[PDB]
Paper text:
In this study, we aimed to structurally, and functionally characterize both cUMP- and cCMP-synthesizing PycC and cUMP receptor PycTIR.
Among the discovered pyrimidine cyclases, only clade E PycC cyclase can synthesize cCMP products. The structure of EaPycC was solved by molecular replacement and refined to 2.2-Å resolution. EaPycC assembles into a head-to-tail homodimer with two symmetric active sites at the dimer interface. Another distinct feature found in EaPycC is a C-terminal Y-shaped structure that comprises two anti-parallel β-sheets (β10–β13) near the active sites. The active site of EaPycC contains two conserved catalytic residues D102 and D146 responsible for divalent metal coordination, which superimposed well with those in PaPycC and BcPycC. In contrast to the UTP-recognition residues, Y50, D94, and R97, identified in BcPycC, EaPycC contains strikingly different specificity-determining residues, F100, R142, and Q144, for CTP binding.
Author numbering:
A (entry chain A): 7 to 21, 69 to 300
B (entry chain B): 0 to 21, 67 to 298
Write the structure that this text describes.
């Protein structure tokens, strides 16, 4: 409520913490920095995009836009922290988050990521309802892409030079999490095939979605026929997820 | 010019990797998310208005590398492209603000740099990056059975009053960054570029004699339709145009 109240107040101005975790340095792999080493290890990759914030400039000055957007981003960061996510990178209009690590089970990683995605979407969709429309600006909404990559498919390593560097992954499923982020509905979440087995492949929460590409549709997000690899993406019903939960 | 031979080792490295299918001593000290002119804003509630050139560099089709290559080879290829891009930006006094998996965010300008110099640096860096990927990596990926990789660059200039530097995030989970229409519009225009193309905003043109030799006005594409401006605020009579930047002819005439 505090973030939503702050945002409402700012919109009236028309013209569990992890404070020591640095960016670009997942704690399970930060030791790879300043070395030439690398490790294969599973991870859940989540890309969060905040859409329509640029429209804020039509009615608000840069300082108010900064307050609104950084408030939304703080809400997102704290949501991720609550569910043991590591914030890897800050975009202007979103976040890159890893779930999992050396002391986390793959099931726990997936559950954490799904809960964090549901809560981020809830905050932006519901707790900020009508606030932007009431002020004559476009509604701000989120898009979240989520994927799971197993150890053999997820390479942790150094990238860059000097301090212009990060410890990050090279993995098809990190890339596909980003791609599926672009595929989501307003305040929606899209997940890859590898997420489903960790939630009993429930068509209760997951609905197969065709991959949209320049006004046309394709059956898969990614295809390697030589390996019989046909990767599907699925809309994640996070609202039904939240309602049908004990907590 | 320089670009014709600058990247020979990077191109050779990438060819070698593709055969494996299944400016200053303190630039090295520059952290991400911490432009040297504004890094002091970290851990503060302070902010400063100051111009900047915002550049977004996107590398497209690199995910296709996974169809034929293992993660370590994909990493070697992408890190080579990234290293060439970082060194290019440093040569033209760019500050690398953020590393993506498939691109970079770069600022040009700062407290001891003229706006003109910032724009010139950014245009030359964009031209050199585009030259490297389009020409020195020509055909290399197709020879090995993967899709051709190309770049897209969006460039914009924001003046002092329209560019707010401030802290974002909390604790160490933070960066010093800009809130500015023109940073956002540089990001937007990046998606508007042609393959190996550069798209710039209106504020870039006066710094290059608005030469239609180099700049071609282009409409903004959005869900199969076209609009005249990247951004419009009618109440301020603000109609912001985007332009293709002919970097090849730019390089030719230097």
């Amino acid at each position: 409520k505090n973030y939503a109240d702050d945002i409402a107040h700012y919109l009236k101005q028309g013209k569990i913490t992890k404070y020591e975790e640095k960016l670009g340095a997942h704690p399970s792999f930060s030791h790879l920095k300043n070395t030439n080493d690398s490790e294969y290890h599973y991870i859940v990759s989540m890309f969060v995009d905040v859409r329509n914030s640029t429209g804020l400039f039509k009615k608000f000055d840069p300082d108010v836009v900064a307050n609104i957007c950084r408030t939304i981003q703080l809400a997102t960061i704290h949501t991720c922290w609550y569910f043991d996510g590591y914030v890897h990178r800050l975009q202007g209009d979103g976040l890159m988050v890893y779930f999992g690590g050396k002391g986390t089970t793959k099931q726990k990683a997936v559950d954490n990521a799904l809960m964090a995605a549901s809560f981020i979407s809830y905050f932006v969709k519901n707790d900020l309802k009508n606030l932007f429309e009431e002020q004559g600006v476009s509604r701000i909404y989120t898009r979240i892409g989520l994927d799971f990559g197993d150890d053999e498919d997820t390479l942790w390593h150094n990238a860059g030079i000097g301090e212009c560097s990060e410890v990050t992954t090279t993995s098809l499923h990190t890339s596909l999490a980003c791609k599926m982020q672009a595929q989501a509905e307003s305040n929606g979440v899209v997940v890859g095939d590898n997420i489903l087995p960790y939630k009993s492949s429930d068509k209760n929460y997951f609905t197969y979605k065709k991959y949209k590409k320049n006004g046309s549709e394709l059956p898969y997000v990614y295809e390697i026929p030589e390996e019989y690899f046909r990767y599907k993406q699925h809309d994640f019903n996070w609202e039904k997820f939240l309602k049908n939960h004990p907590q």
